[PDB]
PDB file of all heavy atoms in Angstrom:
ATOM      1  N   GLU A 372      25.238  -5.031  10.582  1.00 38.35           N
ATOM      2  CA  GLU A 372      24.458  -3.870  10.180  1.00 38.35           C
ATOM      3  C   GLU A 372      23.594  -4.172   8.963  1.00 38.35           C
ATOM      4  O   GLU A 372      22.399  -3.860   8.956  1.00 38.35           O
ATOM      5  CB  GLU A 372      25.389  -2.692   9.895  1.00 38.35           C
ATOM      6  CG  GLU A 372      24.746  -1.543   9.151  1.00 38.35           C
ATOM      7  CD  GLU A 372      25.362  -0.212   9.526  1.00 38.35           C
ATOM      8  OE1 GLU A 372      25.973  -0.130  10.611  1.00 38.35           O
ATOM      9  OE2 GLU A 372      25.241   0.748   8.737  1.00 38.35           O
ATOM     10  N   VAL A 373      24.188  -4.778   7.933  1.00 37.35           N
ATOM     11  CA  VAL A 373      23.440  -5.074   6.713  1.00 37.35           C
ATOM     12  C   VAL A 373      22.356  -6.108   6.980  1.00 37.35           C
ATOM     13  O   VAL A 373      21.230  -5.982   6.481  1.00 37.35           O
ATOM     14  CB  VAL A 373      24.400  -5.538   5.601  1.00 37.35           C
ATOM     15  CG1 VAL A 373      23.635  -6.231   4.493  1.00 37.35           C
ATOM     16  CG2 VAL A 373      25.165  -4.359   5.050  1.00 37.35           C
ATOM     17  N   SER A 374      22.669  -7.136   7.769  1.00 33.71           N
ATOM     18  CA  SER A 374      21.665  -8.135   8.120  1.00 33.71           C
ATOM     19  C   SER A 374      20.452  -7.483   8.773  1.00 33.71           C
ATOM     20  O   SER A 374      19.305  -7.743   8.385  1.00 33.71           O
ATOM     21  CB  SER A 374      22.275  -9.187   9.044  1.00 33.71           C
ATOM     22  OG  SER A 374      21.266  -9.956   9.675  1.00 33.71           O
ATOM     23  N   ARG A 375      20.691  -6.619   9.762  1.00 33.02           N
ATOM     24  CA  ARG A 375      19.568  -5.968  10.432  1.00 33.02           C
ATOM     25  C   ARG A 375      18.814  -5.044   9.484  1.00 33.02           C
ATOM     26  O   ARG A 375      17.576  -5.039   9.464  1.00 33.02           O
ATOM     27  CB  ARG A 375      20.054  -5.193  11.654  1.00 33.02           C
ATOM     28  CG  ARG A 375      20.410  -6.074  12.829  1.00 33.02           C
ATOM     29  CD  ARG A 375      21.148  -5.299  13.896  1.00 33.02           C
ATOM     30  NE  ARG A 375      21.596  -6.177  14.968  1.00 33.02           N
ATOM     31  CZ  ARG A 375      22.476  -5.830  15.898  1.00 33.02           C
ATOM     32  NH1 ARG A 375      23.006  -4.616  15.894  1.00 33.02           N
ATOM     33  NH2 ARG A 375      22.825  -6.699  16.836  1.00 33.02           N
ATOM     34  N   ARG A 376      19.543  -4.259   8.688  1.00 35.54           N
ATOM     35  CA  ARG A 376      18.906  -3.279   7.818  1.00 35.54           C
ATOM     36  C   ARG A 376      18.074  -3.951   6.734  1.00 35.54           C
ATOM     37  O   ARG A 376      17.122  -3.359   6.214  1.00 35.54           O
ATOM     38  CB  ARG A 376      19.980  -2.378   7.210  1.00 35.54           C
ATOM     39  CG  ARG A 376      19.512  -1.402   6.155  1.00 35.54           C
ATOM     40  CD  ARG A 376      20.631  -0.430   5.839  1.00 35.54           C
ATOM     41  NE  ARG A 376      20.312   0.458   4.729  1.00 35.54           N
ATOM     42  CZ  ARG A 376      21.094   1.454   4.330  1.00 35.54           C
ATOM     43  NH1 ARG A 376      22.242   1.685   4.952  1.00 35.54           N
ATOM     44  NH2 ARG A 376      20.733   2.219   3.310  1.00 35.54           N
ATOM     45  N   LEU A 377      18.401  -5.199   6.391  1.00 35.22           N
ATOM     46  CA  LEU A 377      17.618  -5.911   5.385  1.00 35.22           C
ATOM     47  C   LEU A 377      16.426  -6.625   6.014  1.00 35.22           C
ATOM     48  O   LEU A 377      15.317  -6.610   5.460  1.00 35.22           O
ATOM     49  CB  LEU A 377      18.506  -6.898   4.630  1.00 35.22           C
ATOM     50  CG  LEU A 377      19.516  -6.283   3.661  1.00 35.22           C
ATOM     51  CD1 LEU A 377      19.924  -7.298   2.610  1.00 35.22           C
ATOM     52  CD2 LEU A 377      18.959  -5.028   3.010  1.00 35.22           C
ATOM     53  N   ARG A 378      16.644  -7.285   7.156  1.00 35.41           N
ATOM     54  CA  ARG A 378      15.529  -7.902   7.867  1.00 35.41           C
ATOM     55  C   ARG A 378      14.460  -6.871   8.209  1.00 35.41           C
ATOM     56  O   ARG A 378      13.262  -7.191   8.244  1.00 35.41           O
ATOM     57  CB  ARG A 378      16.039  -8.597   9.126  1.00 35.41           C
ATOM     58  CG  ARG A 378      14.991  -9.414   9.841  1.00 35.41           C
ATOM     59  CD  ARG A 378      15.561 -10.749  10.269  1.00 35.41           C
ATOM     60  NE  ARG A 378      16.843 -10.594  10.946  1.00 35.41           N
ATOM     61  CZ  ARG A 378      16.974 -10.252  12.223  1.00 35.41           C
ATOM     62  NH1 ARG A 378      15.900 -10.030  12.963  1.00 35.41           N
ATOM     63  NH2 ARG A 378      18.180 -10.134  12.760  1.00 35.41           N
ATOM     64  N   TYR A 379      14.877  -5.625   8.453  1.00 36.92           N
ATOM     65  CA  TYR A 379      13.928  -4.531   8.622  1.00 36.92           C
ATOM     66  C   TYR A 379      12.963  -4.432   7.450  1.00 36.92           C
ATOM     67  O   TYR A 379      11.741  -4.492   7.638  1.00 36.92           O
ATOM     68  CB  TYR A 379      14.683  -3.216   8.790  1.00 36.92           C
ATOM     69  CG  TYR A 379      13.816  -1.990   8.645  1.00 36.92           C
ATOM     70  CD1 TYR A 379      12.940  -1.609   9.642  1.00 36.92           C
ATOM     71  CD2 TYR A 379      13.884  -1.209   7.500  1.00 36.92           C
ATOM     72  CE1 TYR A 379      12.149  -0.486   9.501  1.00 36.92           C
ATOM     73  CE2 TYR A 379      13.099  -0.085   7.351  1.00 36.92           C
ATOM     74  CZ  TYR A 379      12.234   0.266   8.356  1.00 36.92           C
ATOM     75  OH  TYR A 379      11.447   1.390   8.215  1.00 36.92           O
ATOM     76  N   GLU A 380      13.492  -4.260   6.237  1.00 37.06           N
ATOM     77  CA  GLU A 380      12.633  -4.094   5.072  1.00 37.06           C
ATOM     78  C   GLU A 380      11.788  -5.337   4.831  1.00 37.06           C
ATOM     79  O   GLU A 380      10.620  -5.237   4.432  1.00 37.06           O
ATOM     80  CB  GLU A 380      13.479  -3.765   3.846  1.00 37.06           C
ATOM     81  CG  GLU A 380      13.845  -2.301   3.743  1.00 37.06           C
ATOM     82  CD  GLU A 380      14.391  -1.933   2.383  1.00 37.06           C
ATOM     83  OE1 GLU A 380      13.580  -1.713   1.460  1.00 37.06           O
ATOM     84  OE2 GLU A 380      15.628  -1.870   2.232  1.00 37.06           O
ATOM     85  N   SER A 381      12.359  -6.518   5.081  1.00 37.68           N
ATOM     86  CA  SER A 381      11.593  -7.749   4.905  1.00 37.68           C
ATOM     87  C   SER A 381      10.358  -7.769   5.798  1.00 37.68           C
ATOM     88  O   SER A 381       9.230  -7.931   5.311  1.00 37.68           O
ATOM     89  CB  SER A 381      12.473  -8.963   5.192  1.00 37.68           C
ATOM     90  OG  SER A 381      11.688 -10.131   5.359  1.00 37.68           O
ATOM     91  N   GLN A 382      10.549  -7.608   7.109  1.00 36.13           N
ATOM     92  CA  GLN A 382       9.410  -7.673   8.018  1.00 36.13           C
ATOM     93  C   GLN A 382       8.439  -6.522   7.779  1.00 36.13           C
ATOM     94  O   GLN A 382       7.225  -6.672   7.972  1.00 36.13           O
ATOM     95  CB  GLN A 382       9.901  -7.687   9.461  1.00 36.13           C
ATOM     96  CG  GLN A 382      10.712  -8.918   9.802  1.00 36.13           C
ATOM     97  CD  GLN A 382      10.946  -9.059  11.284  1.00 36.13           C
ATOM     98  OE1 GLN A 382      10.599  -8.173  12.063  1.00 36.13           O
ATOM     99  NE2 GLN A 382      11.535 -10.176  11.689  1.00 36.13           N
ATOM    100  N   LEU A 383       8.947  -5.372   7.330  1.00 35.98           N
ATOM    101  CA  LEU A 383       8.055  -4.255   7.040  1.00 35.98           C
ATOM    102  C   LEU A 383       7.136  -4.578   5.869  1.00 35.98           C
ATOM    103  O   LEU A 383       5.922  -4.337   5.938  1.00 35.98           O
ATOM    104  CB  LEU A 383       8.867  -2.994   6.756  1.00 35.98           C
ATOM    105  CG  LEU A 383       8.046  -1.725   6.555  1.00 35.98           C
ATOM    106  CD1 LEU A 383       7.342  -1.353   7.841  1.00 35.98           C
ATOM    107  CD2 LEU A 383       8.932  -0.591   6.084  1.00 35.98           C
ATOM    108  N   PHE A 384       7.694  -5.120   4.783  1.00 32.47           N
ATOM    109  CA  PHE A 384       6.848  -5.549   3.676  1.00 32.47           C
ATOM    110  C   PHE A 384       5.867  -6.627   4.110  1.00 32.47           C
ATOM    111  O   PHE A 384       4.719  -6.634   3.655  1.00 32.47           O
ATOM    112  CB  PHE A 384       7.696  -6.047   2.509  1.00 32.47           C
ATOM    113  CG  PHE A 384       8.382  -4.953   1.750  1.00 32.47           C
ATOM    114  CD1 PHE A 384       9.397  -5.247   0.862  1.00 32.47           C
ATOM    115  CD2 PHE A 384       8.004  -3.633   1.916  1.00 32.47           C
ATOM    116  CE1 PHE A 384      10.031  -4.243   0.158  1.00 32.47           C
ATOM    117  CE2 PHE A 384       8.635  -2.625   1.215  1.00 32.47           C
ATOM    118  CZ  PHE A 384       9.648  -2.931   0.334  1.00 32.47           C
ATOM    119  N   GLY A 385       6.290  -7.536   4.988  1.00 32.28           N
ATOM    120  CA  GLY A 385       5.368  -8.557   5.464  1.00 32.28           C
ATOM    121  C   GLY A 385       4.164  -7.972   6.182  1.00 32.28           C
ATOM    122  O   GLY A 385       3.015  -8.349   5.915  1.00 32.28           O
ATOM    123  N   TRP A 386       4.409  -7.029   7.094  1.00 27.54           N
ATOM    124  CA  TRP A 386       3.300  -6.430   7.828  1.00 27.54           C
ATOM    125  C   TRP A 386       2.407  -5.604   6.908  1.00 27.54           C
ATOM    126  O   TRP A 386       1.175  -5.641   7.031  1.00 27.54           O
ATOM    127  CB  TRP A 386       3.829  -5.584   8.984  1.00 27.54           C
ATOM    128  CG  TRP A 386       4.317  -6.410  10.130  1.00 27.54           C
ATOM    129  CD1 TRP A 386       5.595  -6.500  10.590  1.00 27.54           C
ATOM    130  CD2 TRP A 386       3.533  -7.279  10.955  1.00 27.54           C
ATOM    131  NE1 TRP A 386       5.657  -7.364  11.655  1.00 27.54           N
ATOM    132  CE2 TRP A 386       4.402  -7.856  11.898  1.00 27.54           C
ATOM    133  CE3 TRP A 386       2.180  -7.621  10.990  1.00 27.54           C
ATOM    134  CZ2 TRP A 386       3.964  -8.756  12.863  1.00 27.54           C
ATOM    135  CZ3 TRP A 386       1.748  -8.514  11.950  1.00 27.54           C
ATOM    136  CH2 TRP A 386       2.636  -9.071  12.873  1.00 27.54           C
ATOM    137  N   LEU A 387       3.007  -4.862   5.971  1.00 26.75           N
ATOM    138  CA  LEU A 387       2.200  -4.110   5.014  1.00 26.75           C
ATOM    139  C   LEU A 387       1.328  -5.038   4.176  1.00 26.75           C
ATOM    140  O   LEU A 387       0.174  -4.712   3.870  1.00 26.75           O
ATOM    141  CB  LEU A 387       3.098  -3.264   4.114  1.00 26.75           C
ATOM    142  CG  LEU A 387       3.044  -1.752   4.325  1.00 26.75           C
ATOM    143  CD1 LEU A 387       3.907  -1.345   5.505  1.00 26.75           C
ATOM    144  CD2 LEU A 387       3.472  -1.024   3.061  1.00 26.75           C
ATOM    145  N   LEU A 388       1.859  -6.203   3.803  1.00 22.54           N
ATOM    146  CA  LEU A 388       1.074  -7.152   3.023  1.00 22.54           C
ATOM    147  C   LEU A 388      -0.100  -7.690   3.829  1.00 22.54           C
ATOM    148  O   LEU A 388      -1.216  -7.803   3.309  1.00 22.54           O
ATOM    149  CB  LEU A 388       1.959  -8.298   2.537  1.00 22.54           C
ATOM    150  CG  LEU A 388       1.415  -9.072   1.338  1.00 22.54           C
ATOM    151  CD1 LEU A 388       1.293  -8.161   0.132  1.00 22.54           C
ATOM    152  CD2 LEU A 388       2.286 -10.274   1.016  1.00 22.54           C
ATOM    153  N   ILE A 389       0.137  -8.047   5.094  1.00 20.90           N
ATOM    154  CA  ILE A 389      -0.967  -8.505   5.939  1.00 20.90           C
ATOM    155  C   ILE A 389      -2.046  -7.433   6.034  1.00 20.90           C
ATOM    156  O   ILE A 389      -3.248  -7.719   5.920  1.00 20.90           O
ATOM    157  CB  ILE A 389      -0.451  -8.905   7.332  1.00 20.90           C
ATOM    158  CG1 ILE A 389       0.512 -10.081   7.231  1.00 20.90           C
ATOM    159  CG2 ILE A 389      -1.608  -9.258   8.244  1.00 20.90           C
ATOM    160  CD1 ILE A 389       1.240 -10.363   8.520  1.00 20.90           C
ATOM    161  N   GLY A 390      -1.633  -6.181   6.235  1.00 16.45           N
ATOM    162  CA  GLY A 390      -2.604  -5.101   6.328  1.00 16.45           C
ATOM    163  C   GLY A 390      -3.422  -4.942   5.060  1.00 16.45           C
ATOM    164  O   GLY A 390      -4.647  -4.787   5.107  1.00 16.45           O
ATOM    165  N   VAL A 391      -2.752  -4.977   3.905  1.00 13.83           N
ATOM    166  CA  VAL A 391      -3.458  -4.786   2.641  1.00 13.83           C
ATOM    167  C   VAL A 391      -4.416  -5.942   2.381  1.00 13.83           C
ATOM    168  O   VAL A 391      -5.523  -5.745   1.867  1.00 13.83           O
ATOM    169  CB  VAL A 391      -2.452  -4.607   1.490  1.00 13.83           C
ATOM    170  CG1 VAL A 391      -3.143  -4.738   0.146  1.00 13.83           C
ATOM    171  CG2 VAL A 391      -1.759  -3.259   1.600  1.00 13.83           C
ATOM    172  N   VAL A 392      -4.018  -7.162   2.743  1.00 14.60           N
ATOM    173  CA  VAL A 392      -4.910  -8.306   2.568  1.00 14.60           C
ATOM    174  C   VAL A 392      -6.153  -8.150   3.434  1.00 14.60           C
ATOM    175  O   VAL A 392      -7.276  -8.431   2.993  1.00 14.60           O
ATOM    176  CB  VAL A 392      -4.164  -9.616   2.875  1.00 14.60           C
ATOM    177  CG1 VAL A 392      -5.147 -10.748   3.104  1.00 14.60           C
ATOM    178  CG2 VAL A 392      -3.224  -9.955   1.738  1.00 14.60           C
ATOM    179  N   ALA A 393      -5.977  -7.693   4.675  1.00 14.89           N
ATOM    180  CA  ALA A 393      -7.135  -7.462   5.534  1.00 14.89           C
ATOM    181  C   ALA A 393      -8.053  -6.398   4.944  1.00 14.89           C
ATOM    182  O   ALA A 393      -9.284  -6.549   4.946  1.00 14.89           O
ATOM    183  CB  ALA A 393      -6.678  -7.066   6.935  1.00 14.89           C
ATOM    184  N   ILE A 394      -7.470  -5.312   4.430  1.00 10.30           N
ATOM    185  CA  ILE A 394      -8.276  -4.243   3.848  1.00 10.30           C
ATOM    186  C   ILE A 394      -9.052  -4.752   2.639  1.00 10.30           C
ATOM    187  O   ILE A 394     -10.227  -4.416   2.452  1.00 10.30           O
ATOM    188  CB  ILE A 394      -7.387  -3.038   3.491  1.00 10.30           C
ATOM    189  CG1 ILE A 394      -7.052  -2.242   4.749  1.00 10.30           C
ATOM    190  CG2 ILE A 394      -8.073  -2.139   2.483  1.00 10.30           C
ATOM    191  CD1 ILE A 394      -8.242  -1.529   5.341  1.00 10.30           C
ATOM    192  N   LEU A 395      -8.418  -5.578   1.806  1.00 11.82           N
ATOM    193  CA  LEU A 395      -9.113  -6.104   0.634  1.00 11.82           C
ATOM    194  C   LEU A 395     -10.244  -7.042   1.034  1.00 11.82           C
ATOM    195  O   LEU A 395     -11.317  -7.020   0.422  1.00 11.82           O
ATOM    196  CB  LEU A 395      -8.135  -6.815  -0.300  1.00 11.82           C
ATOM    197  CG  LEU A 395      -7.560  -6.000  -1.462  1.00 11.82           C
ATOM    198  CD1 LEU A 395      -6.626  -4.896  -0.982  1.00 11.82           C
ATOM    199  CD2 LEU A 395      -6.851  -6.922  -2.446  1.00 11.82           C
ATOM    200  N   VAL A 396     -10.020  -7.885   2.045  1.00 12.46           N
ATOM    201  CA  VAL A 396     -11.095  -8.748   2.528  1.00 12.46           C
ATOM    202  C   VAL A 396     -12.282  -7.910   2.982  1.00 12.46           C
ATOM    203  O   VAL A 396     -13.429  -8.148   2.572  1.00 12.46           O
ATOM    204  CB  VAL A 396     -10.588  -9.663   3.658  1.00 12.46           C
ATOM    205  CG1 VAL A 396     -11.756 -10.308   4.380  1.00 12.46           C
ATOM    206  CG2 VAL A 396      -9.659 -10.724   3.104  1.00 12.46           C
ATOM    207  N   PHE A 397     -12.026  -6.906   3.820  1.00 12.32           N
ATOM    208  CA  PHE A 397     -13.101  -6.052   4.306  1.00 12.32           C
ATOM    209  C   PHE A 397     -13.813  -5.303   3.191  1.00 12.32           C
ATOM    210  O   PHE A 397     -15.044  -5.191   3.230  1.00 12.32           O
ATOM    211  CB  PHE A 397     -12.569  -5.043   5.326  1.00 12.32           C
ATOM    212  CG  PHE A 397     -13.594  -4.040   5.770  1.00 12.32           C
ATOM    213  CD1 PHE A 397     -14.689  -4.437   6.511  1.00 12.32           C
ATOM    214  CD2 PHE A 397     -13.468  -2.703   5.439  1.00 12.32           C
ATOM    215  CE1 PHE A 397     -15.636  -3.527   6.919  1.00 12.32           C
ATOM    216  CE2 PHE A 397     -14.414  -1.785   5.846  1.00 12.32           C
ATOM    217  CZ  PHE A 397     -15.500  -2.198   6.587  1.00 12.32           C
ATOM    218  N   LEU A 398     -13.086  -4.817   2.188  1.00 13.14           N
ATOM    219  CA  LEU A 398     -13.722  -4.089   1.102  1.00 13.14           C
ATOM    220  C   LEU A 398     -14.524  -4.986   0.173  1.00 13.14           C
ATOM    221  O   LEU A 398     -15.612  -4.588  -0.251  1.00 13.14           O
ATOM    222  CB  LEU A 398     -12.681  -3.317   0.285  1.00 13.14           C
ATOM    223  CG  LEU A 398     -12.395  -1.885   0.749  1.00 13.14           C
ATOM    224  CD1 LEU A 398     -12.099  -0.976  -0.435  1.00 13.14           C
ATOM    225  CD2 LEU A 398     -13.552  -1.336   1.570  1.00 13.14           C
ATOM    226  N   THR A 399     -14.042  -6.190  -0.136  1.00 13.91           N
ATOM    227  CA  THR A 399     -14.843  -7.086  -0.961  1.00 13.91           C
ATOM    228  C   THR A 399     -16.103  -7.517  -0.218  1.00 13.91           C
ATOM    229  O   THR A 399     -17.177  -7.640  -0.821  1.00 13.91           O
ATOM    230  CB  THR A 399     -14.016  -8.292  -1.424  1.00 13.91           C
ATOM    231  OG1 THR A 399     -14.694  -8.944  -2.505  1.00 13.91           O
ATOM    232  CG2 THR A 399     -13.792  -9.295  -0.311  1.00 13.91           C
ATOM    233  N   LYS A 400     -16.004  -7.716   1.101  1.00 15.17           N
ATOM    234  CA  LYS A 400     -17.208  -7.955   1.889  1.00 15.17           C
ATOM    235  C   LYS A 400     -18.178  -6.787   1.776  1.00 15.17           C
ATOM    236  O   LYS A 400     -19.313  -6.949   1.319  1.00 15.17           O
ATOM    237  CB  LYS A 400     -16.847  -8.213   3.351  1.00 15.17           C
ATOM    238  CG  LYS A 400     -16.586  -9.669   3.665  1.00 15.17           C
ATOM    239  CD  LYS A 400     -17.896 -10.408   3.881  1.00 15.17           C
ATOM    240  CE  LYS A 400     -17.680 -11.727   4.599  1.00 15.17           C
ATOM    241  NZ  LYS A 400     -18.970 -12.369   4.973  1.00 15.17           N
ATOM    242  N   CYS A 401     -17.740  -5.593   2.181  1.00 14.57           N
ATOM    243  CA  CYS A 401     -18.612  -4.425   2.192  1.00 14.57           C
ATOM    244  C   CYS A 401     -19.112  -4.039   0.806  1.00 14.57           C
ATOM    245  O   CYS A 401     -20.080  -3.279   0.708  1.00 14.57           O
ATOM    246  CB  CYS A 401     -17.879  -3.241   2.827  1.00 14.57           C
ATOM    247  SG  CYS A 401     -18.872  -1.751   3.055  1.00 14.57           S
ATOM    248  N   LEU A 402     -18.500  -4.547  -0.260  1.00 14.30           N
ATOM    249  CA  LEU A 402     -18.968  -4.251  -1.605  1.00 14.30           C
ATOM    250  C   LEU A 402     -19.891  -5.315  -2.167  1.00 14.30           C
ATOM    251  O   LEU A 402     -20.727  -5.000  -3.019  1.00 14.30           O
ATOM    252  CB  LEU A 402     -17.784  -4.073  -2.558  1.00 14.30           C
ATOM    253  CG  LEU A 402     -18.024  -3.030  -3.648  1.00 14.30           C
ATOM    254  CD1 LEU A 402     -18.310  -1.675  -3.021  1.00 14.30           C
ATOM    255  CD2 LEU A 402     -16.839  -2.952  -4.592  1.00 14.30           C
ATOM    256  N   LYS A 403     -19.756  -6.564  -1.730  1.00 14.19           N
ATOM    257  CA  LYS A 403     -20.678  -7.600  -2.176  1.00 14.19           C
ATOM    258  C   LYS A 403     -22.102  -7.266  -1.748  1.00 14.19           C
ATOM    259  O   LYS A 403     -23.002  -7.177  -2.588  1.00 14.19           O
ATOM    260  CB  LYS A 403     -20.272  -8.965  -1.627  1.00 14.19           C
ATOM    261  CG  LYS A 403     -21.077 -10.103  -2.214  1.00 14.19           C
ATOM    262  CD  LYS A 403     -20.818 -11.398  -1.474  1.00 14.19           C
ATOM    263  CE  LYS A 403     -21.866 -11.620  -0.398  1.00 14.19           C
ATOM    264  NZ  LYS A 403     -21.850 -13.016   0.112  1.00 14.19           N
ATOM    265  N   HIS A 404     -22.308  -7.085  -0.441  1.00 14.74           N
ATOM    266  CA  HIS A 404     -23.650  -6.844   0.080  1.00 14.74           C
ATOM    267  C   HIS A 404     -24.287  -5.611  -0.543  1.00 14.74           C
ATOM    268  O   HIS A 404     -25.413  -5.677  -1.049  1.00 14.74           O
ATOM    269  CB  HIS A 404     -23.609  -6.702   1.601  1.00 14.74           C
ATOM    270  CG  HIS A 404     -23.152  -7.935   2.311  1.00 14.74           C
ATOM    271  ND1 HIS A 404     -23.390  -8.151   3.651  1.00 14.74           N
ATOM    272  CD2 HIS A 404     -22.464  -9.016   1.873  1.00 14.74           C
ATOM    273  CE1 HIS A 404     -22.873  -9.313   4.006  1.00 14.74           C
ATOM    274  NE2 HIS A 404     -22.306  -9.858   2.946  1.00 14.74           N
ATOM    275  N   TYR A 405     -23.587  -4.474  -0.509  1.00 13.91           N
ATOM    276  CA  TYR A 405     -24.178  -3.224  -0.977  1.00 13.91           C
ATOM    277  C   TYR A 405     -24.637  -3.316  -2.426  1.00 13.91           C
ATOM    278  O   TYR A 405     -25.565  -2.607  -2.828  1.00 13.91           O
ATOM    279  CB  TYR A 405     -23.186  -2.073  -0.806  1.00 13.91           C
ATOM    280  CG  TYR A 405     -23.784  -0.712  -1.076  1.00 13.91           C
ATOM    281  CD1 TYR A 405     -24.338   0.039  -0.049  1.00 13.91           C
ATOM    282  CD2 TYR A 405     -23.807  -0.182  -2.360  1.00 13.91           C
ATOM    283  CE1 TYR A 405     -24.892   1.279  -0.291  1.00 13.91           C
ATOM    284  CE2 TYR A 405     -24.360   1.056  -2.610  1.00 13.91           C
ATOM    285  CZ  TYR A 405     -24.900   1.782  -1.574  1.00 13.91           C
ATOM    286  OH  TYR A 405     -25.451   3.018  -1.821  1.00 13.91           O
ATOM    287  N   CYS A 406     -24.022  -4.185  -3.219  1.00 14.76           N
ATOM    288  CA  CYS A 406     -24.423  -4.402  -4.604  1.00 14.76           C
ATOM    289  C   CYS A 406     -24.838  -5.860  -4.762  1.00 14.76           C
ATOM    290  O   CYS A 406     -24.041  -6.711  -5.166  1.00 14.76           O
ATOM    291  CB  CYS A 406     -23.294  -4.026  -5.562  1.00 14.76           C
ATOM    292  SG  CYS A 406     -22.837  -2.280  -5.512  1.00 14.76           S
TER     293      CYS A 406
END
């Protein structure tokens, strides 16, 4: 139970990090050109 409940939070943080990195890439792109 503990192994699964911890691997849950690990993979969740991993996916959230990938998402945030993608969002930052897109925003720095869309902000370079406009300015």
Side-chain angles (χ1 to χ4, degrees):
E372 166 149 339
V373 163
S374 165
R375 285 168 185 167
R376 173 170 174 175
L377 288 202
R378 187 136 48 81
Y379 166 75
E380 278 194 82
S381 165
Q382 296 192 354
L383 185 66
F384 286 166
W386 285 115
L387 250 81
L388 201 63
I389 297 170
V391 167
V392 163
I394 282 291
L395 265 68
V396 166
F397 174 67
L398 270 215
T399 196
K400 271 278 197 172
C401 185
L402 214 59
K403 188 190 95 166
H404 297 199
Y405 188 92
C406 297

